[PDB]
Amino acid sequence: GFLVAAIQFPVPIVNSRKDIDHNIESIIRTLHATKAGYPGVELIIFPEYSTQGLNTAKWLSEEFLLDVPGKETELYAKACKEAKVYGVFSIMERNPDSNKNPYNTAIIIDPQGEIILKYRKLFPWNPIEPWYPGDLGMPVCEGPGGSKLAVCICHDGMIPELAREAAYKGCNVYIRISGYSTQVNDQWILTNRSNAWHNLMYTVSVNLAGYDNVFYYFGEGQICNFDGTTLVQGHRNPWEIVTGEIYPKMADNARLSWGLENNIYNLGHRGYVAKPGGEHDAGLTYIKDLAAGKYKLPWEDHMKIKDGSIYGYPTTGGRFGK
Amino acid sequence: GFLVAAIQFPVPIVNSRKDIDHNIESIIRTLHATKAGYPGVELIIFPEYSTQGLNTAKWLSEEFLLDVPGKETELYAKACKEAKVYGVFSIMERNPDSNKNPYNTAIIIDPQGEIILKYRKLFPWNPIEPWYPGDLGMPVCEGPGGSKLAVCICHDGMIPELAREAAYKGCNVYIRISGYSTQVNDQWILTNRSNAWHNLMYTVSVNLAGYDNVFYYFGEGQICNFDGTTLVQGHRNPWEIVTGEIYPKMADNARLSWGLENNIYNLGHRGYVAKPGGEHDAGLTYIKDLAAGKYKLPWEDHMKIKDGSIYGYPTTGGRFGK
Amino acid sequence: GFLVAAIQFPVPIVNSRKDIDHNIESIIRTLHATKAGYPGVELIIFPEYSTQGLNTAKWLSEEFLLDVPGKETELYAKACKEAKVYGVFSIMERNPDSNKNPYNTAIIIDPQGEIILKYRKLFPWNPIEPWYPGDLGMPVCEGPGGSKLAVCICHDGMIPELAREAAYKGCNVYIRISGYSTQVNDQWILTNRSNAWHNLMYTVSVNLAGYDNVFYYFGEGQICNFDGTTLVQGHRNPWEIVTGEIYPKMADNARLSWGLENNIYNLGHRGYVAKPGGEHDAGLTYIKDLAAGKYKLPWEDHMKIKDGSIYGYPTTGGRFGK
Amino acid sequence: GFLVAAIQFPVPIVNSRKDIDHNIESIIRTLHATKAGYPGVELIIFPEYSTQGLNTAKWLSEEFLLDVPGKETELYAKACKEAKVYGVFSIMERNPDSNKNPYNTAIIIDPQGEIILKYRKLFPWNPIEPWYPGDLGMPVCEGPGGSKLAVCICHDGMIPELAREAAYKGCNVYIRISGYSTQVNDQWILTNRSNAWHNLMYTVSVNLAGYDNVFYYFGEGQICNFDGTTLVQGHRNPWEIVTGEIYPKMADNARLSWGLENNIYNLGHRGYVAKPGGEHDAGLTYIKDLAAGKYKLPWEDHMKIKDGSIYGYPTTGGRFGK
Amino acid sequence: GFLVAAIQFPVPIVNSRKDIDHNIESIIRTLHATKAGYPGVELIIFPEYSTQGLNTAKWLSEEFLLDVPGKETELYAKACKEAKVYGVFSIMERNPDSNKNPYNTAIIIDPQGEIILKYRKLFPWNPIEPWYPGDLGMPVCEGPGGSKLAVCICHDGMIPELAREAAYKGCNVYIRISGYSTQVNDQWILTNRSNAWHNLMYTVSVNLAGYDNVFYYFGEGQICNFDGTTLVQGHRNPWEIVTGEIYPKMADNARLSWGLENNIYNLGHRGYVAKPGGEHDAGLTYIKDLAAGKYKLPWEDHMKIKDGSIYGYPTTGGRFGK
Amino acid sequence: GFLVAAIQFPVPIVNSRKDIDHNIESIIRTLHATKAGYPGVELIIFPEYSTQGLNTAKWLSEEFLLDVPGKETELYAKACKEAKVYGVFSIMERNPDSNKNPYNTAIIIDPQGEIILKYRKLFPWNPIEPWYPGDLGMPVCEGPGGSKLAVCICHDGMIPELAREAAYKGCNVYIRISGYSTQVNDQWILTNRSNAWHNLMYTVSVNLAGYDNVFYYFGEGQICNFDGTTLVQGHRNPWEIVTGEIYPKMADNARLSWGLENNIYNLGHRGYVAKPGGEHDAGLTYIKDLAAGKYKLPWEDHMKIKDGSIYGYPTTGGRFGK
């Protein structure tokens, strides 16, 4: 197995690129301090918004956007290389397409300083969020101790289909980085557990400590076992390092060995006792509709919130904010 | 609103058609007594295996199988008409195709005594259960108090895609009837909550009190709100009637009005704020595979349990256990 | 003893006087139904904003304000006389001084239909609430079963000095009516307990089920014993009636008999065992300051929120929002 | 921020001045052992009665009384200087006025070995306690990491007015030392939380492990955040060191920045939206009465426990015990 | 099944035979009211000291002692016959041997008004209680719904051997009536569970609401299943009626059918699988000693409390306290 | 006091003597790693089945059986000597009598490498277990920090008479080693607490992490105080080391000093206030029957499970498995 660490990082108010640089250096010191304090740690996870903070007046400006990769990711890579750990980082990424809004991005860097996974938030916390819908799917990569890692961001964790997709591609440790998991805290705890159980995989999840120079007790850290049991739940303190031992091969072995608990197999092989191989047609219209690009809820023509003019967003198209 | 009752029904050991008829009369008496005790109740729900019990040496025999509809469902129909309630019942159903095993079936009968929903368990609990995988999809019907009801059976409730399917078809009250959910108890409670939250719908779930003539404290009754909160959690007693008031239109209104919480809408309309209208393709390979009937986990090759041979079931198909 | 009921009343969105009259009829129907359902009940308590709702765009308009007493309170009076109960009601009250904003008012009406207590919210919830600070002090009246009742409103319950004041005037059952206490939920539960314990009195507290036509699971009902123990904690359901038996004389007897636990006596008689009779001056500067109208925190100079300007309220005084 | 430590100190039976000296040396070793084990600790807190034990047959004798300052406090000071920590100590203090009973005293010593705060219990746990009512008010001092410290003793923590007084004078970390917080344990936990929330400050509280050479599991350690959440609650073990990180400036910033949660400001500025500056008259009779030295409860002429002859104390005056 | 009720009865301070007669009438009224309120109830249980209270200055006087049977038990008998219930009552019983102290006695009266069980407290709560150790063993009687009832009193329930004895004689519902179990509350709850589990029987336990004219929230009501699970745990209210359905035959069936769980059988038949029939001698020295009347703890020589001298009781034997 | 450690040891599938040797070496490394990580630890406890695993196809074979003492115990002794700790080990012991089935054995080894306690499971978890009923009684030995140690195995902990026997012989720290304490987990937690309280002693209890190369989250570690409070409850992780400080002399002092709580003394001295010395006859038939070898339950002639032919065991006699 391996030791994982989820950092309840407190980000101060960010007003300039100068503040962004100090923030990056704070993350780096924290990474090193964590390896020093926990000599066995192999994976260190930082929360959503931890690089550039949460300044909604500036976060679409060019000063506030970074490239992935870029000079800042190289600094993170250098840190991961020196500390010899896998690290997970949150970056609001300048869209290579200058016409489009930036992405909300997560990267995993390995102990060699290589970016081995790049994920762009697939379901931007709408209507509040300006981030462009991610186009890299749900990737999975090799991690420490036999792990296959995947990451989702904030609201993404509320979508069980995304956890399934990760697992379907081999993920056995599903990471969630968040930056507003209070006031809907119960549902965050709930889905971290269900994402684990549904797919027989570990979940490791972290929330930002805070962002406003005042309150820094919004942080969360949760590790769930592949049976959905919460193995570790951090107390909520700024700078809290939530740690636990993970055994990816145990999740693998449960997937290989289990019968009654093997729901992920059952999904595509229902009733395999009565019908050799199981029924491969799950019998679900929404799956077929979603595959065909025609998912439509029966009540869609009667909805209220469907565009972001309740705070201020152009939803016809174009580019805005910069 | 409407008042729902979930019955923690105890079934004796079932050795004969005589015992099955006894269960039927006992269920009917319980139905009437519940209506008498709770004059406002509009929906009364009985657990999986409450009609025929769980005699695994006999459960595939003709003596132990019923037709749906048949004389027995007509008895249940008569009871629902007399009490003027909706009732949910479990029947192991003779397969009209004599080359296939029986189904594990649930019905909802209305206060007119008409069967308004027939559901055949899509995900038999394997490798222990020999039931043929269901072929009626996940139907939804009109229920009391503005509800759109759907029923799943036991193990079905572990599959989040199935809860999504019910919701997709309009369900705002998702019923789960269970027979031996204990020892998977934590995961049963968990998924009852996540099924509700993921889909912004109520869940109402019940487990059989027991089945072995000895222990009858396996019963469960759980009502979850559309935010995933457990509203009512039954005490575990044989014959316990777990009740709660349900407001289906409140769930409907959440679905029409909520933004960030509206995960079910977001699934099919990714980022309507940044992308015009939102993207309708996340790039989920498993959805495309499942839709196409080719869902295949990367590790299927090394799995230990892919038929019923561990329980001595034949592995080649056809009707068995007669 | 006497039986108390706290009603988790749901209020629709209120757009008109028509809707207000609807709430009034709904409250009256609920009052009668509660008496019918609980024939022994002697005190029925409705939440803050249950009469007029929480339309912040309209709540300061003449259409949305009532007189106390007026035709509407006479309707409530008639209901209490008919049901033979004490009732607690919330009314946003037109200020007779046209140069001042309306009050946030609570009344208790007796089983004779007489208003026996009128309280104007001493601590409006700022900066969001525009209500004029109350000018009737913290009154106490005779209630059922040997009780001396007092009512505070919402935010008022966060001020321990106010609970002390009610006790000081004889209160042994302290009622708190609330309208949007959620998100301050932990602190609401906490202070309901501390208000009871600090003063050796019961507390009975209720929160509105909801107010926005969508979510009605914000309701709370809490009854605390005079030792601070929560005796009854409601489930959160719209329309839930939270009930409990209260024994006011037991609190009186604790106040007369207890030694170490008698903190309320000790406050004004410090050390009667060492000093003859006890010292009546602890040297509490804030008490002397507050009494003199000069309470001033050392950090007031640097405070960010000291008027309603954040919500766009005028800062110079007088009547606004008409 | 800074690390605090609350020591669940077990005191053996104390029969002589010789025992008192051994006890002092035990406290000192514990202080040093704590700094060694927790290199970052800046504040180490010892419980009530930890210096002289709890021998109610001898505790009024001259052999058992110490001066503050005196040779024993100099030993504590020397320890705090060598370890470079702030320390909090409990001393039963000989009254400089030989006519009067001794005080129950707490001191805070800084890393320079200076006594920077001296507090005498204001509300002696009557009727059991012989200690003279304190005459030093509720002082506040500068502590580590931007803290302003204040201390109360045992029953004092049950009086919210004392927590308010500390806060009013700038306290942002309120310390409570106790020596009998079992059997009324719930109320201790409760008030540590409410004292924190009511005033937007941290509370750090400790109870003596035991005193009778037999049972040493009465110890408690509790750290509460300024929102009233218990951040750390020790398990109850003798010698248990309960630690946590405290961020005084965060409490300060909440006091500066918050609106809805700013109850301490509201107390003296009620309804400041409707009335510029708020109403400075809180409308509370007991505050005015207490300021004028005429606090009188309505039921005072009917009370039982008002003097300490239920165990044995002369309440007319004079000196006794020595 | 049968429905049981445990009454959290409050007793006033008892100063006279007049007060005792008052308690008797109050108990009888409560018995009838319980039957009226719960028409299905077949067993109604009152706490220890509910007849005579807990006046320790008077409790050994002739005025405070009753005969069993006597005129007072005949009153209780009449009530049980009229209500057609089984009732459990507590009576401090005059010892027919004038050279011995009175007994602490419990009776069960049947729906015919016959005393069918008389039990004298085997383990008086020492050193506080002066009752003569009981001499009727642990009797068992036929109760409602296939039950075999046994009663123990207060402190008795702390002795697992006594619960074993009741079971050994056939008991499947073990009743415990208590008078001041608080402050031993955790251990009372604990042993109610272990007594059930150890012996595969239900336990039904009640504690007096209070006894001192001031505090009446000491009441407890607890029903445990034969697996040790708490089925019902009362709220603490004076007059609270704690009810639950009990299925004695289910316990009987567990005892007949269970293997690994059948600890009560295993105790007397060690290893029937390896040794033919099982060994009937574990080599338990304390059992042999206790049987022989020579149970002696290795440390008895150094024990501090072995008589009632701490409470001022005489230590030489005979009748006292008259 | 002293520090104890309970090791949630994960044992892999064991197929040969070669696997047994690797397992022994794993235990030894774990012992050393534990002393290194916890320099103050004096007692390190390994769970049932940790030496030879749980291979029910091979565990009766000569290859799988060890002698006590033997070369393997000498390796454990050498480890305990080098690490200077007391260790507790589980060994399936070859019966010196070749006619009889092997024993399920636990040993305690001291810091000198001497086996100071040897216990053979007295009540073999029947009917599943082949182990011969133990013949060494319930021994007690001197341990670290003033402790008197005793051990029981798995199901033995469900028998309160065995805990009593240990205590009766001086035990003040009662150890339980288990290897299947899930699915009856509640009852394990329950009895660890009751065994402690009933006898005024500490309990320290551990369960095997797992055994099947798949699932290793069955582990448990629980330390209970002599009042029955759980002081430490481990999270369930493979390799988890559950530690706590134990103070045996405190248990001793409670046994010497306590009155109301002294149930272990009361057992053999009931009602000692009324009757000098107490009544030495406990009044219990089962105690006398058990001492005389004639323990017989009233329902014994109607039982089902009484021999192990439900899995496959010759219960007439002889030798089988090898």
Coordinates of N, CA and C in Angstrom, one line a residue, chain C residues 122-123 125-127 129-134 155 158 160-161 164-165 167-168 187 190-191 197-198 227 255-257 259-260 263-276 284-287 289 291 293 295-296 298-300 303-307 313 315 317, chain D residues 122-123 125-127 129-134 155 158 160-162 164-165 167-168 187 190 197-198 227 255-257 259-260 263-275 280 284-287 289 291 295-296 298-300 302-306 313-316:
Chain C
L122 N -36.0 42.9 19.6 CA -35.0 43.8 20.1 C -33.8 43.9 19.3
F123 N -33.4 42.7 18.7 CA -32.2 42.6 17.9 C -32.5 42.1 16.5
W125 N -32.0 41.2 12.7 CA -30.9 40.4 12.2 C -30.2 41.3 11.1
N126 N -29.1 42.0 11.5 CA -28.4 42.9 10.6 C -27.2 42.3 10.0
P127 N -26.8 42.8 8.8 CA -27.4 43.9 8.0 C -28.6 43.6 7.1
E129 N -31.8 42.7 7.8 CA -33.2 43.1 8.2 C -33.3 44.6 8.5
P130 N -34.4 45.2 8.0 CA -34.6 46.6 8.1 C -35.5 47.0 9.3
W131 N -35.8 46.1 10.2 CA -36.8 46.3 11.2 C -36.3 47.3 12.2
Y132 N -37.1 48.2 12.7 CA -36.7 49.1 13.8 C -36.5 48.3 15.1
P133 N -35.4 48.7 15.8 CA -35.1 48.0 17.1 C -36.3 48.1 18.0
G134 N -36.7 47.0 18.7 CA -37.9 47.0 19.5 C -37.8 47.9 20.7
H155 N -32.7 35.8 15.7 CA -31.4 36.4 16.1 C -31.4 36.8 17.6
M158 N -29.6 34.5 20.0 CA -28.1 34.5 20.1 C -27.5 35.4 21.1
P160 N -27.2 36.1 24.9 CA -27.5 35.4 26.2 C -28.0 36.4 27.2
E161 N -27.6 37.7 27.1 CA -28.2 38.7 28.0 C -29.7 38.8 28.0
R164 N -31.2 36.0 29.8 CA -31.1 36.3 31.2 C -32.1 37.3 31.7
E165 N -32.4 38.3 30.8 CA -33.4 39.3 31.1 C -34.8 38.7 31.3
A167 N -35.5 35.6 32.1 CA -35.4 34.8 33.4 C -35.6 35.8 34.6
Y168 N -34.8 36.9 34.5 CA -34.8 37.9 35.6 C -36.2 38.4 35.9
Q187 N -25.5 26.7 15.7 CA -25.4 27.8 16.7 C -26.8 28.0 17.3
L190 N -27.3 25.2 19.7 CA -26.4 25.4 20.8 C -27.0 26.5 21.8
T191 N -27.5 27.6 21.2 CA -28.0 28.7 22.1 C -29.3 28.3 22.7
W197 N -30.0 26.2 30.1 CA -29.1 26.0 31.2 C -28.7 27.2 32.0
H198 N -28.2 28.3 31.3 CA -27.7 29.5 32.0 C -28.8 30.0 33.0
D227 N -31.9 22.0 32.5 CA -30.5 21.7 32.6 C -29.7 21.8 31.3
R255 N -34.7 26.5 40.6 CA -34.2 27.9 41.0 C -34.3 28.2 42.5
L256 N -35.2 27.6 43.2 CA -35.4 27.8 44.6 C -34.4 26.9 45.5
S257 N -34.1 25.7 44.9 CA -33.4 24.7 45.7 C -31.9 24.4 45.4
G259 N -27.9 24.7 44.4 CA -26.8 25.5 45.0 C -25.8 25.8 43.9
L260 N -24.9 24.8 43.7 CA -23.8 25.0 42.7 C -24.4 25.3 41.3
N263 N -26.6 29.3 38.9 CA -25.7 30.4 38.3 C -26.4 31.7 38.2
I264 N -27.7 31.7 38.0 CA -28.5 32.9 37.9 C -28.6 33.7 39.2
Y265 N -28.6 32.9 40.3 CA -28.6 33.6 41.7 C -27.2 34.1 42.0
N266 N -26.2 33.2 41.7 CA -24.8 33.5 41.9 C -24.3 34.8 41.2
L267 N -24.8 35.1 40.1 CA -24.4 36.3 39.3 C -24.6 37.6 40.1
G268 N -25.6 37.7 40.9 CA -25.9 38.9 41.7 C -25.6 38.8 43.1
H269 N -25.1 37.6 43.6 CA -24.7 37.4 45.0 C -23.4 36.6 45.1
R270 N -22.3 37.2 44.7 CA -21.0 36.5 44.6 C -20.5 36.1 46.0
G271 N -20.4 34.8 46.3 CA -19.7 34.3 47.5 C -20.4 34.7 48.8
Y272 N -21.5 34.2 49.0 CA -22.3 34.4 50.3 C -21.7 33.6 51.5
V273 N -20.8 32.6 51.1 CA -20.2 31.8 52.1 C -18.9 32.4 52.8
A274 N -18.2 33.1 51.9 CA -17.0 33.8 52.4 C -17.2 35.2 52.8
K275 N -17.9 36.0 51.9 CA -18.3 37.3 52.2 C -19.8 37.3 52.7
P276 N -20.0 38.1 53.8 CA -21.3 38.1 54.4 C -22.4 38.5 53.4
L284 N -17.6 44.2 36.4 CA -17.8 43.9 34.9 C -18.1 45.2 34.2
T285 N -17.0 45.7 33.5 CA -17.1 47.0 32.8 C -18.2 47.1 31.7
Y286 N -18.4 45.9 31.1 CA -19.4 46.0 30.0 C -20.8 46.2 30.4
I287 N -21.1 45.6 31.6 CA -22.4 45.8 32.2 C -22.7 47.3 32.6
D289 N -21.0 49.8 31.3 CA -21.1 50.5 30.0 C -22.4 50.4 29.3
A291 N -25.4 49.5 30.6 CA -26.4 50.2 31.4 C -26.4 51.7 31.1
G293 N -25.5 53.1 28.3 CA -25.6 53.4 26.9 C -24.3 53.7 26.1
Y295 N -21.8 51.1 25.6 CA -21.1 49.8 25.2 C -20.3 50.1 23.9
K296 N -19.0 49.8 24.0 CA -18.2 50.1 22.8 C -17.1 49.1 22.8
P298 N -13.5 47.4 21.7 CA -12.3 48.1 21.4 C -12.0 48.2 19.8
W299 N -12.6 47.3 19.1 CA -12.3 47.2 17.6 C -13.3 47.8 16.7
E300 N -14.3 48.6 17.2 CA -15.4 49.1 16.4 C -14.9 50.0 15.3
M303 N -14.3 48.0 12.0 CA -15.3 47.1 11.5 C -15.8 47.4 10.2
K304 N -16.1 46.4 9.4 CA -16.6 46.5 8.0 C -18.1 46.7 7.8
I305 N -18.8 46.1 8.7 CA -20.3 46.2 8.6 C -21.0 46.8 9.8
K306 N -21.4 48.1 9.7 CA -22.0 48.9 10.7 C -23.2 49.6 10.3
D307 N -23.7 49.3 9.0 CA -24.9 49.8 8.5 C -25.4 48.8 7.4
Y313 N -29.3 49.4 1.5 CA -30.1 50.2 2.4 C -29.5 51.6 2.6
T315 N -28.4 54.8 4.8 CA -27.6 54.7 6.0 C -27.8 55.9 6.9
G317 N -30.9 57.1 8.2 CA -32.1 57.0 9.1 C -33.4 57.2 8.4
Chain D
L122 N -14.2 34.7 40.7 CA -15.2 35.8 41.0 C -16.5 35.2 41.7
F123 N -16.8 34.0 41.4 CA -18.1 33.4 41.9 C -17.9 32.1 42.5
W125 N -17.6 28.6 43.7 CA -18.5 27.4 43.7 C -19.3 27.2 45.0
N126 N -20.2 28.1 45.3 CA -20.9 28.0 46.6 C -22.1 27.1 46.5
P127 N -22.5 26.4 47.6 CA -22.0 26.7 49.0 C -20.8 25.9 49.4
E129 N -17.6 25.9 48.6 CA -16.3 26.5 48.6 C -16.1 27.6 49.6
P130 N -14.9 27.6 50.3 CA -14.6 28.7 51.3 C -13.9 29.9 50.7
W131 N -13.5 29.8 49.4 CA -12.7 30.9 48.8 C -13.4 32.2 48.8
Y132 N -12.7 33.3 49.1 CA -13.3 34.6 49.1 C -13.5 35.1 47.6
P133 N -14.7 35.8 47.4 CA -15.0 36.4 46.1 C -13.8 37.2 45.6
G134 N -13.4 37.0 44.3 CA -12.3 37.7 43.7 C -12.5 39.2 43.5
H155 N -16.7 26.9 37.9 CA -18.1 27.4 37.8 C -18.2 28.7 37.1
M158 N -19.7 28.9 33.7 CA -21.1 28.8 33.5 C -21.8 30.2 33.5
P160 N -22.2 33.5 31.4 CA -21.9 34.0 30.1 C -21.4 35.5 30.2
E161 N -21.9 36.2 31.3 CA -21.5 37.6 31.5 C -20.0 37.7 31.6
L162 N -19.3 36.7 32.2 CA -17.9 36.7 32.4 C -17.1 36.5 31.1
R164 N -18.4 37.4 28.2 CA -18.6 38.7 27.5 C -17.6 39.7 28.0
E165 N -17.4 39.8 29.3 CA -16.5 40.8 29.9 C -15.1 40.6 29.4
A167 N -14.2 39.2 26.5 CA -14.2 39.6 25.1 C -14.3 41.1 24.9
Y168 N -15.1 41.7 25.8 CA -15.3 43.2 25.7 C -13.9 43.9 25.9
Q187 N -22.9 20.2 30.8 CA -23.1 21.6 30.9 C -21.7 22.3 30.7
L190 N -21.1 22.3 27.0 CA -22.1 23.2 26.4 C -21.6 24.6 26.5
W197 N -18.9 30.9 20.8 CA -19.8 31.4 19.8 C -20.3 32.8 20.1
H198 N -20.8 33.0 21.4 CA -21.4 34.2 21.8 C -20.5 35.4 21.6
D227 N -16.8 29.9 16.2 CA -18.1 29.6 15.7 C -18.8 28.7 16.7
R255 N -14.5 39.2 13.9 CA -15.1 40.3 14.7 C -15.1 41.6 13.8
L256 N -14.1 41.8 13.0 CA -14.0 42.9 12.2 C -14.9 42.9 10.9
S257 N -15.1 41.7 10.4 CA -15.6 41.5 9.0 C -17.1 41.1 9.0
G259 N -21.1 40.3 9.6 CA -22.3 41.0 9.8 C -23.3 40.1 10.6
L260 N -23.9 39.1 9.9 CA -25.0 38.3 10.5 C -24.6 37.6 11.8
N263 N -22.8 38.9 16.9 CA -23.7 39.1 18.0 C -23.1 40.1 19.1
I264 N -21.8 40.0 19.3 CA -21.1 40.8 20.3 C -21.3 42.3 20.0
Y265 N -21.3 42.7 18.7 CA -21.5 44.0 18.3 C -23.0 44.4 18.4
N266 N -23.8 43.5 18.0 CA -25.3 43.7 18.0 C -25.8 44.0 19.4
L267 N -25.2 43.4 20.5 CA -25.6 43.7 21.8 C -25.7 45.1 22.2
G268 N -24.8 45.9 21.7 CA -24.8 47.4 22.0 C -25.2 48.3 20.9
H269 N -25.6 47.6 19.7 CA -25.9 48.4 18.5 C -27.1 47.7 17.8
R270 N -28.2 47.5 18.6 CA -29.3 46.7 18.0 C -30.1 47.5 16.9
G271 N -30.4 46.8 15.8 CA -31.1 47.4 14.7 C -30.5 48.5 14.0
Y272 N -29.2 48.4 13.8 CA -28.4 49.5 13.2 C -28.7 49.8 11.7
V273 N -29.5 48.9 11.1 CA -29.9 49.2 9.7 C -31.0 50.3 9.7
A274 N -32.0 50.1 10.6 CA -33.1 51.0 10.7 C -32.8 52.3 11.5
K275 N -31.8 52.2 12.4 CA -31.4 53.3 13.3 C -29.9 53.4 13.3
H280 N -28.6 52.1 21.5 CA -27.6 51.8 22.5 C -28.1 51.3 23.8
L284 N -32.8 46.1 28.8 CA -32.7 45.0 29.7 C -32.6 45.6 31.2
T285 N -33.6 45.3 32.0 CA -33.6 45.7 33.4 C -32.5 45.1 34.3
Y286 N -32.1 43.9 34.0 CA -31.1 43.3 34.9 C -29.7 43.9 34.8
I287 N -29.4 44.3 33.5 CA -28.2 45.0 33.3 C -28.1 46.3 34.1
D289 N -30.0 47.1 36.8 CA -30.0 46.7 38.2 C -28.6 46.2 38.6
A291 N -25.7 47.0 37.3 CA -24.8 48.1 37.3 C -25.0 49.0 38.6
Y295 N -29.4 43.9 41.7 CA -29.8 42.7 41.1 C -30.6 41.9 42.1
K296 N -31.9 41.6 41.8 CA -32.7 40.8 42.7 C -33.7 40.0 41.9
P298 N -37.0 37.7 41.2 CA -38.3 37.7 41.7 C -38.7 36.7 42.8
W299 N -37.9 35.6 42.8 CA -38.2 34.5 43.7 C -37.2 34.4 44.9
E300 N -36.4 35.4 45.1 CA -35.3 35.4 46.1 C -35.8 35.2 47.5
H302 N -38.0 33.2 48.6 CA -38.5 31.9 48.7 C -37.5 30.8 48.6
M303 N -36.2 31.1 48.6 CA -35.1 30.2 48.3 C -34.7 29.4 49.5
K304 N -34.1 28.2 49.2 CA -33.5 27.3 50.3 C -32.0 27.6 50.5
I305 N -31.2 27.1 49.5 CA -29.8 27.3 49.6 C -29.3 28.7 49.4
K306 N -28.9 29.3 50.5 CA -28.4 30.7 50.4 C -27.2 30.9 51.4
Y313 N -20.1 26.1 57.2 CA -19.4 27.4 57.0 C -20.1 28.5 57.7
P314 N -19.3 29.3 58.5 CA -19.7 30.5 59.1 C -19.9 31.6 58.0
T315 N -21.2 32.1 57.8 CA -21.5 33.0 56.8 C -21.8 34.4 57.3
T316 N -21.6 34.6 58.6 CA -21.8 35.9 59.2 C -20.6 36.8 59.0

